[PDB]
């Protein structure tokens, strides 16, 4: 059994397509509601689980918090695909550029388009894009504090070697 | 019948263990490998086997492993491996001795037929017993061969280099309707250790180095998302291993999260395969619950571990706690519906001194019994009925 | 246990070869007389060298039935002896003049001669088999496959 | 669709559904529920996976689903999943408003009473059916035959069960379960194929080996003959292509698999198989009626469809009266008339019989348990439904 | 000394005459292994009997060679006698004469093949084949009575008066501790517990022995069990798993009073006893109401002796004084009775000796025995 999100037990959380707009700790501009600064929000969960969840090859999705965790678990693999050989001062800028560049949302090019509900309206697509850009900017910034933990000029190999690993053999 | 000590051969996917019944260890334990070439024809005489065939990779021979997933699957190589075992290492005469051979529970009838015709027509041995290997491994558990030390009811978990299977046996009978088998063991966890060294791009990732990192450095943790987190908090857990290359020079390997994530293949086999999804503690509960009701207290009370790939540090305790968690959760569901208490069930997973080769010690201990010559296919039965005499499963229920 | 006890043999009586082929009308001693008068004509035709007129007369009647092995074997002995005494260059002149009924009596008995090599020379029967099938066509073997089993 | 009673054979392997007087099921589909999963397998924009996927929608798409079965052995294991079959059955197969409708349900002859209670409670309190009736599945299969005597044996996906009947009286002391049927033969087919090295242990692969069993298996008429063809000859070997495109060779597993209905010990059950179970049931009936049972054994249910099963069963009862009543004396065997009824429709005989019975009692409003009677007596309202 | 061997239709009881209880007592079972796969040479054998069959039962198929008091399987019944003599009593049988037991109205060919195989194999000096109910009368210490035996396989009434037995008044019914166990295996399905193996039948027997009781009035206990969980009890399987059981505790024994619960056409044991005493002559009927002796393990349930009285007093006329004699040792009363009989000074002339079997063959037993 792979590790599912803690937030699938949460209820009446806001939703877009069928992503969960889970509480977030961040500085980036966007629609995600502030988390408690003392608590693990979905990005501390997604970074904590990623290195275990990308070895499994069979993952049942319980609800919209797992659909969110999967998008995070896939975007960590894109970031570790980018980061090889960078200085932290370059990696911040390269992975923010990766986070902000134009991407396909579910319902548009998207790999898991079989499992994610398309946006409910022309307006739901914008609240989805402005969430997923805020999410993946924070996810990149948070990840970099782990991969450049002990030394600031060389990505720690214990994080970089998952760049070949690929959650359930899917990628963005 | 001849009186000579029956010869015992546990041909594993990893190691062949060879010897004579009634000795206190195998005469040989060496890899199930054959080195072959890749005006008279002699390329079928030039081969080598075992520890003397690892020395031959640099002399331009191709090593191949004729047993894969616990089954013989090259019959040319296995016949040459047996002739060389019998006439070089065991140095015996087949016409004088009964042989105990071993195979997994779910082997095809075709492999017992091929084993029988090779033994009776090529070597001409006096008689043959083809034992289901985990049924023997129970008999290594006893404190002695004597009748008062026996405990003929217990689940036996066997895990070698090529197959793991769980056999329930009760009152000396193998409960064949309940055998579970999974072709994921000591080699599949080596290919996973090898796969990790290779993704980190370490200086050496040859099979012999992943094989050594398993048994030097790896262990079974309680839970991998806490163990990944511990490897951040506790940086002395990244061991450094010194490996010497095929061409005779030093290297150094950092060993990482494969120290726990590799043995986790047994307790989460989704890491290794899309096909075998059930983890070993739940695979054991499926054995004991499929088994008839009155033996279940006895089958949980004595879960014997066997075969080299069960030796990982903390393997017995992980299996005991995860199986005890499955079992007391199911009993507590039943206390809930009744409102009454229960006496529960004790689950003991038995690691023991002969665990590394338990199938051989089981075969040795059984073959000493005066009745053994009557359980063999004698070559007189072979000359009457041919190699089809070995085709019937002893273990499973057969129609007809 | 019960699984092996056959019941079909005692509750559903199967057909017999005499239901599929009509039973012979001539009695055993009536055919044993009819053959024993012909074999001396065939033995005589060898002794006077006209062995081909031996076959033409021997082949004018055929014994059949599960009651007559002790004279079907004597008829086969005379037939194989007559086939062993016809010159190989005369065979194509005999076979092209046989009726399709006589041909289907020749090839039927050469497949009885080929069934017992420890008493009959196969080499001359295989030679007759090549020549009778090459001249008269493959259907002459199909009429043997389909023929009565007590021939 | 129709104003008459709805009828529902919620079987262990297939739901079949329609109305009174239907000559064949209006719909049938696997009794399966699935949840979305990703699995190191193909993904496609050709289909959209909703949070709960069921029946035909799941079975057509099951590479993408964690398939689960709400029933085993003829009992509902998980009512949250059976609710997701019943929602689908009424709201998007039949397309019905159940408010005040009358429905006929079925269950096997020896179920836990808590199963019938919670199944009727659900009909009155999720859907609000105005009337419910529950019939023993094998007595329905006797209305399909237009018949009133002769022992009826039903073998489904979940359970094989037998109900002797004589002159319209149902012999409740002789009704019996053999807990071996079409699913135990399927778990056994997986276990036979595992000896060849083919693994089918994903939840979605179970429907593939059901389709394989249903396509290729047959009941051996003479075991030493099929063991001859099996061991001496290639003639049994057959190639099956999975929905993956993989081809797998299957041989002795064609006869050796459905043999577990005749020999339950192959699947670890100590019970006697079909021939010995039907014999020990007929031979337990009173002396005056045994003739009228052997003269009309009625087969029913999908697991009675294996090629050769009618002929093997008839032989194996002639063969067994011969051992156990004649002691091997051939003199009387021709006097033993046994007849198996094995009609073309028989997979659906429980539904076709239910659709006949639901016409016989459509207008007799006191014959059903009414919602108004359920809501005053609770579970005790079901005591209307016989002994 | 003489041996006394009760041929229990489910529970064999063996011992020496004058001893006050069976020296050994064990299930009348022969069990065979249901698995062919074996640890070779490791002490297995092709038949386990009595307590070897019970303690090993999970891997065995168990079959009793007695059904309804008739031996159905002779090649296996002699294994049980071999066990009674050589493994339980630990004697040579050829040194000691054997008193055997039989039900009334049994096939005479059963008693013939029993007396045949007992001399022709075990070579006992002498033997006898007494009826179980007249044996039970000796253990009760009286000369008048209407013994109601109720074993594993049979139940029967033998009206008996000053030693004159009434063979026209005997009743026998094939309803007993086996059929009550079949019906418990059937009705427990309603809880969702499925028992089907001949091993699990022994679990359902142990439930029936520990938890079942006779309702004093059935449709009042049925109403009480529906009204509250006050009547429910729990049992722990040989698996640590827990069973809960309720009105099934008394619906099982009620079958003995209502055979129509198992579809069988018969009077219950109250009506069968009444119709047996009402078949005796009116001078005797005055006394046998005061002497309903009970015997055999199916007469052992809690509440049976009181409910047996409340039923039989509704059939008997109110002027009579009506009593059930149910000893605390009643399970063994036929064996204690045989132990008394085989010890009598006056009995020793009426054994069948080996000498007079040779003069007549087994059909002598029909004149030497009742
Ligand atoms: N031709 C066939 N050959 C083999 N098996 C068949 C065949 N046709 C149907 N089956 C099997 O029958 C089962 C489905 O039959 P059916 O619908 O009668 O079962 P069910 O009613 O759902 O089960 P149950 O009555 O136990 O609840 C499946 O196992 C299916 O594979
Ligand atoms: N201490 C150990 N810890 C983990 N694995 C071990 C240990 N010692 C040996 N092994 C492994 O045991 C396997 C060999 O076990 P064996 O019983 O001989 O298997 P097989 O019979 O299939 O050849 C190899 O994978 C080997 O690396
Ligand atoms: N305490 C008890 N309460 C209820 N039933 C009992 C009790 N003890 C034993 N039994 C019943 O006793 C039966 C055996 O009775 P027994 O007289 O020894 O029969 P038999 O002599 O014919 O072998 C068993 O079938 C069992 O059902
Ligand atoms: F082949 Be080893 F026994 F796994
Ligand atoms: Mg091994
Ligand atoms: Mg059905
Ligand atoms: Mg008794």
Curated annotation (Swiss-Prot), chain B:
Keywords: Actin-binding, ATP-binding, Cytoplasm, Cytoskeleton, Nucleotide-binding. Functions as ATP-binding component of the Arp2/3 complex which is involved in regulation of actin polymerization and together with an activating nucleation-promoting factor (NPF) mediates the formation of branched actin networks. Seems to contact the pointed end of the daughter actin filament. May be involved in cytokinesis. GO terms for biological process: actin cortical patch organization; actin filament branching; actin filament polymerization; Arp2/3 complex-mediated actin nucleation; endocytosis. Gene3D superfamilies: 3.30.420.40, Actin, Chain A, domain 4. The gene is act2. Component of the Arp2/3 complex composed of arp2, act2, arc1/p41-ARC, arc2/p34-ARC, arc3/p21-ARC, arc4/p20-ARC and arc5/p16-ARC. Its main location: cytoplasm. It comes from the Eukaryota. One of its GO terms (cellular component) is cytosol. It is found in: Cytoplasm, Cytoskeleton, Actin patch. GO terms for molecular function: actin filament binding; ATP binding. Belongs to the actin family. ARP3 subfamily. This is Actin-related protein 3. The keyword Transmembrane helix does not apply.
Swiss-Prot record, chain C:
One of its GO terms (cellular component) is Arp2/3 protein complex. Its main location: cytoplasm. Keywords: Actin-binding, Cytoplasm, Cytoskeleton. InterPro entries: ARPC5 (IPR006789), ARPC5_sf (IPR036743). It is found in: Cytoplasm, Cytoskeleton, Actin patch. GO terms for molecular function: actin filament binding. One of its GO terms (biological process) is regulation of actin filament polymerization. Pfam families: P16-Arc (PF04699). Functions as a component of the Arp2/3 complex which is involved in regulation of actin polymerization and together with an activating nucleation-promoting factor (NPF) mediates the formation of branched actin networks. Component of the Arp2/3 complex composed of arp2, act2, arc1/p41-ARC, arc2/p34-ARC, arc3/p21-ARC, arc4/p20-ARC and arc5/p16-ARC. Belongs to the ARPC5 family. This is Actin-related protein 2/3 complex subunit 5. It comes from Schizosaccharomyces pombe (strain 972 / ATCC 24843). The lineage of its organism: Eukaryota, Fungi, Dikarya, Ascomycota, Taphrinomycotina. The gene is arc5.
Swiss-Prot record, chain D:
SUPFAM superfamilies: Actin-like ATPase domain (SSF53067). Gene3D superfamilies: 3.30.420.40, Actin, Chain A, domain 4. It is found in: Cytoplasm, Cytoskeleton, Actin patch. GO terms for biological process: actin cortical patch assembly; actin filament branching; Arp2/3 complex-mediated actin nucleation; endocytosis. GO terms for molecular function: actin filament binding; ATP binding. The keyword Cytoplasm applies. GO terms for cellular component: actin cortical patch; Arp2/3 protein complex; cell cortex; cell cortex of cell tip; medial cortex. It comes from the Eukaryota. Keywords: Actin-binding, ATP-binding, Cytoplasm, Cytoskeleton, Nucleotide-binding. ATP binds at residues 156-158, 210-214, 301-306. InterPro entries: Actin, Actin/actin-like_CS, ATPase_NBD. The keyword Plastid does not apply. PROSITE patterns: ACTINS_ACT_LIKE. Belongs to the actin family. ARP2 subfamily. Functions as ATP-binding component of the Arp2/3 complex which is involved in regulation of actin polymerization and together with an activating nucleation-promoting factor (NPF) mediates the formation of branched actin networks. Seems to contact the pointed end of the daughter actin filament. During cytokinesis it colocalizes to the cortical actin patches until spetation is complete. Has a role in the mobility of these patches. Essential for viability. Component of the Arp2/3 complex composed of arp2, act2, arc1/p41-ARC, arc2/p34-ARC, arc3/p21-ARC, arc4/p20-ARC and arc5/p16-ARC. PANTHER family: ACTIN (PTHR11937). This is Actin-related protein 2. It comes from Schizosaccharomyces pombe (strain 972 / ATCC 24843) (Fission yeast).
Swiss-Prot record, chain E:
The modification N6-methyllysine is found at residue 79. The modification ADP-ribosylarginine is found at residue 172. Keywords: Acetylation, ADP-ribosylation, ATP-binding, Cytoplasm, Cytoskeleton, Hydrolase, Methylation, Muscle protein, Nucleotide-binding, Oxidation. Pfam families: Actin. One of its GO terms (molecular function) is ATP binding. InterPro entries: Actin, Actin/actin-like_CS, Actin_CS, ATPase_NBD. Oxidation of Met-39 and Met-42 by MICALs (MICAL1, MICAL2 or MICAL3) to form methionine sulfoxide promotes actin filament depolymerization. MICAL1 and MICAL2 produce the (R)-S-oxide form. The (R)-S-oxide form is reverted by MSRB1 and MSRB2, which promotes actin repolymerization. One of its GO terms (cellular component) is stress fiber. It is an enzyme of class 3 (hydrolase). SUPFAM superfamilies: Actin-like ATPase domain. The modification Methionine (R)-sulfoxide is found at residues 39, 42. Residues 105-118, 353-365 are annotated as: Interaction with alpha-actinin. It catalyses: ATP + H2O = ADP + phosphate + H(+). Its EC number is 3.6.4.-. The modification Tele-methylhistidine is found at residue 68. It is found in: Cytoplasm, Cytoskeleton. The modification N6-malonyllysine is found at residue 56. One of its GO terms (biological process) is skeletal muscle fiber development. Its main location: cytoplasm. In vertebrates 3 main groups of actin isoforms, alpha, beta and gamma have been identified. The alpha actins are found in muscle tissues and are a major constituent of the contractile apparatus. The beta and gamma actins coexist in most cell types as components of the cytoskeleton and as mediators of internal cell motility. Belongs to the actin family. Actins are highly conserved proteins that are involved in various types of cell motility and are ubiquitously expressed in all eukaryotic cells. This is Actin, alpha skeletal muscle. The gene is ACTA1.
């Amino acid at each position: 059994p792979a590790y599912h999100s803690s937030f699938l037990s949460l209820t009446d959380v806001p939703t877009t397509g069928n992503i969960a707009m889970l509480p977030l700790k961040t500085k980036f501009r966007g629609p995600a509601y502030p988390a408690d600064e003392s608590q693990m929000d979905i990005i501390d969960e997604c970074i904590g689980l990623f290195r275990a969840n990308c070895f499994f090859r069979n993952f049942e999705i319980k609800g919209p918090a797992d659909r969110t965790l999967i998008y995070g678990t896939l975007f960590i693999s894109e970031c570790l695909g980018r980061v090889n050989g960078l200085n932290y001062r370059d990696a911040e800028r390269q992975l923010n550029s990766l986070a902000l560049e134009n991407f396909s949302i579910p319902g548009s090019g998207f790999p898991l388009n079989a499992l994610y509900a398309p946006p409910l309206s022309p307006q739901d697509a914008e609240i989805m894009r402005t969430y997923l850009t805020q999410f993946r900017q924070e996810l990149a910034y948070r990840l970099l504090s782990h991969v450049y933990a002990t030394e600031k000029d060389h990505p720690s190999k214990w994080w970089t070697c998952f760049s070949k690993r690929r959650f359930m053999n899917k990628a963005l | 019948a001849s009186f000579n000590v029956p010869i015992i051969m546990d041909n594993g996917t990893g190691y062949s263990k060879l010897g004579y019944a009634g000795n206190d260890a195998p005469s040989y334990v060496f890899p199930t490998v054959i080195a072959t070439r890749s005006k008279r024809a002699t390329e079928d005489l030039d081969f080598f086997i075992g520890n003397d065939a690892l020395k031959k990779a640099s002399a331009g021979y191709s090593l191949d492993y004729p047993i894969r997933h616990g089954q013989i699957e090259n019959w040319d190589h296995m016949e040459r491996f047996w002739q060389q075992s019998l006439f070089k290492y065991l140095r015996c005469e087949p016409e004088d001795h009964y042989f105990l051979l071993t195979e997994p529970p779910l082997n095809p009838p075709e492999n017992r037929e091929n084993t029988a015709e090779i033994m009776f027509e090529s070597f001409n041995c006096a008689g043959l017993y083809i034992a289901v290997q985990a049924v023997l491994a129970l008999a290594a558990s006893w404190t002695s061969s004597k009748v008062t030390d026996r405990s003929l009811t217990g689940t036996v978990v066997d895990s070698g280099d090529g197959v793991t299977h769980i056999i329930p046996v009760a009152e000396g009978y193998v409960i064949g309707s309940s055998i579970k088998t999974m072709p994921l063991a000591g080699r599949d966890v080596t290919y996973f250790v090898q796969s990790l060294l290779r993704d980190r791009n370490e200086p050496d990732s040859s099979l012999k180095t992943a094989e050594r990192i398993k048994e030097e450095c790896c262990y079974v943790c309680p839970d991998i998302v806490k163990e990944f987190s511990r490897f951040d908090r506790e940086p002395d857990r990244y061991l450094k291993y010194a490996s010497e290359s095929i061409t005779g020079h030093s290297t150094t390997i950092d060993v990482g999260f494969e120290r726990f994530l590799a043995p986790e293949i047994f307790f989460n086999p989704e890491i290794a395969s899309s096909d075998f999804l059930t983890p070993l503690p739940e695979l054991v509960d499926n054995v004991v619950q499929s088994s008839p009701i009155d033996v279940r207290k006895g089958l949980y009370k004595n879960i014997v571990l066997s075969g080299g790939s069960t030796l990982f540090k903390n393997f017995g305790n992980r299996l005991q706690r995860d199986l005890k968690r499955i079992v007391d959760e199911r009993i507590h569901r039943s206390e809930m519906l009744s409102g009454a208490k229960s006496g529960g069930v004790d689950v003991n997973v038995i690691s023991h001194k002969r665990q590394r080769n338990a199938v051989w010690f089981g075969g040795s201990l059984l073959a000493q019994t005066p009745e053994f010559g009557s359980y063999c296919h004698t070559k007189a039965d072979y000359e009457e009925y041919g190699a089809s005499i070995a085709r019937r499963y002893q273990i499973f229920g057969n129609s007809l | 246990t019960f699984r092996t006890l056959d019941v079909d043999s005692i509750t559903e009586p199967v057909l017999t070869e005499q239901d599929i082929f009509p039973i012979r009308n001539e009695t055993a001693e009536q055919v044993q007389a009819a053959v024993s008068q012909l074999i001396p004509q065939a033995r005589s035709a060898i002794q006077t060298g006209n062995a081909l007129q031996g076959l033409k007369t021997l082949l004018s009647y055929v014994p059949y039935g599960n009651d007559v092995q002790e004279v079907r074997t004597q008829y086969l002995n005379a037939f194989v002896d007559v086939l062993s005494n016809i010159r190989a260059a005369d065979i194509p002149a005999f076979v092209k003049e046989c009726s399709t009924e006589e041909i289907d009596n020749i090839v039927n008995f050469i497949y009885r001669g080929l069934a017992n090599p420890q008493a009959y020379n196969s080499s001359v029967l295989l030679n007759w088999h090549e020549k009778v099938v090459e001249i008269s066509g493959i259907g002459c073997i199909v009429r043997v496959l389909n023929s009565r089993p007590d021939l | 669709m129709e104003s008459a009673p709805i009828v529902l054979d919620n079987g262990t392997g297939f739901v079949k559904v329609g109305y009174a007087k239907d000559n064949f099921p209006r719909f049938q589909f696997p009794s399966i529920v699935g949840r979305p999963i990703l699995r190191a397998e193909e993904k496609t924009g050709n289909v959209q996976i909703k949070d709960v996927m069921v029946g035909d929608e799941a079975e057509a798409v099951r590479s993408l689903l964690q398939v689960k079965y709400p029933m085993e052995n003829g009992i509902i294991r998980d009512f949250e999943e059976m609710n997701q079959l019943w929602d689908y059955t009424f709201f998007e197969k039949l397309k019905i408003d159940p408010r005040g409708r009358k429905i006929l349900l079925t269950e096997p002859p020896m179920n836990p009473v808590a199963n019938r209670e919670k199944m009727c409670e659900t009909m009155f309190e999720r859907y609000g059916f105005g009337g419910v009736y529950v019939a023993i599945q094998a007595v329905l299969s006797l209305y399909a035959q237009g018949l009133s005597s002769g022992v009826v044996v039903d073998s489904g996906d979940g359970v094989t069960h037998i109900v002797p009947v004589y002159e319209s009286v149902v012999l409740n002391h002789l009704v019996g379960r053999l807990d071996v049927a079409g699913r135990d033969a399927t778990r056994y087919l997986i276990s036979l194929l595992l000896r060849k090295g083919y693994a089918f242990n994903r939840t979605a692969d179970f429907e593939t080996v059901r389709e394989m069993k249903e396509k290729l298996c047959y009941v051996s008429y003479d075991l030493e003959l099929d063991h001859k063809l099996s061991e001496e000859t290639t003639v049994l070997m057959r190639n099956y292509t999975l929905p993956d495109g993989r081809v797998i060779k299957v041989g002795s597993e064609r006869y050796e698999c459905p043999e577990c209905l005749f020999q339950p010990h192959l699947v670890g059950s100590e019970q006697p198989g079909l021939s010995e179970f039907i014999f020990d049931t007929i031979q337990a009936a009173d002396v005056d009626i045994r003739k009228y049972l052997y003269r009309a054994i009625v087969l029913s249910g999908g697991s009675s469809m294996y090629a050769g099963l009618p002929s093997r069963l008839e032989k194996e009862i002639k063969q067994l009266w011969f051992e156990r009543v004649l002691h091997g004396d051939p003199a009387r065997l021709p006097n033993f008339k046994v007849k198996i009824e094995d009609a073309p429709r028989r997979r659906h005989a429980v539904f076709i019989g239910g659709a006949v019975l639901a016409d016989i009692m459509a207008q007799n409003d006191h014959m059903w348990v009414s919602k108004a009677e359920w809501e005053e007596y609770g579970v005790r309202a079901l005591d209307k439904l016989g002994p | 000394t003489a041996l006394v061997c009760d041929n229990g239709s489910g529970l064999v009881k063996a011992g020496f005459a004058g001893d006050d209880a069976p020296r050994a007592v064990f299930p009348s079972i022969v069990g065979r292994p249901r698995h062919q796969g074996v640890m070779v040479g490791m002490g297995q054998k092709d038949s386990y009997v009595g307590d070897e069959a019970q303690s090993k039962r999970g891997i065995l198929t168990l079959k009793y060679p007695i059904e309804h008091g008739i031996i159905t399987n002779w090649d296996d019944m002699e294994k049980i006698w071999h066990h009674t003599f050589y493994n339980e009593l630990r004697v040579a049988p050829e040194e000691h004469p054997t008193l055997l037991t039989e039900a009334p109205l049994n096939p005479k060919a059963n008693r013939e093949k029993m007396t045949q195989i007992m001399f022709e194999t075990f070579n006992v000096p002498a033997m006898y084949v007494a009826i179980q109910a007249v044996l039970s009368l000796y253990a009760s210490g009286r000369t008048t009575g209407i013994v109601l035996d109720s074993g594993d396989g049979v139940t029967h009434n033998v009206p008996i008066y000053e030693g004159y037995a009434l063979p026209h008044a005997i009743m026998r019914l094939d309803l007993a501790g086996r059929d009550l166990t079949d019906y418990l295996m059937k009705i427990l399905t309603e809880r969702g517990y499925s028992f089907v193996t001949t091993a699990e039948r022994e679990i359902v027997r142990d439930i029936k022995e520990k938890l079942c009781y006779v309702a004093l009035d059935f449709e009042n206990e049925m109403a009480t069990a529906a009204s509250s969980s006050s009547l429910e009890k729990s049992y722990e399987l040989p698996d640590g798993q827990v069973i809960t059981i309720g009105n099934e505790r008394f619906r099982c024994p009620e079958t003995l009073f209502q055979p129509s619960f198992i579809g069988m056409e018969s009077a219950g044991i109250h009506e069968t006893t009444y119709n047996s005493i009402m078949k005796c002559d009116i001078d005797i009927r005055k006394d046998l109401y005061a002497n309903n002796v009970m015997s055999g393990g199916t007469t052992m349930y809690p509440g049976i002796a009181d409910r047996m009285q409340k039923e039989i007093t509704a059939l008997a006329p109110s002027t009579m004084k009506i009593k059930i004699i149910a000893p605390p040792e009643r399970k063994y009363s036929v064996w204690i009775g045989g132990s008394i009989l085989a010890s009598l000074s006056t009995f020793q002339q009426m054994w069948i000796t080996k000498q007079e079997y040779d003069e007549a063959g087994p059909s002598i037993v029909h004149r030497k025995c009742f």
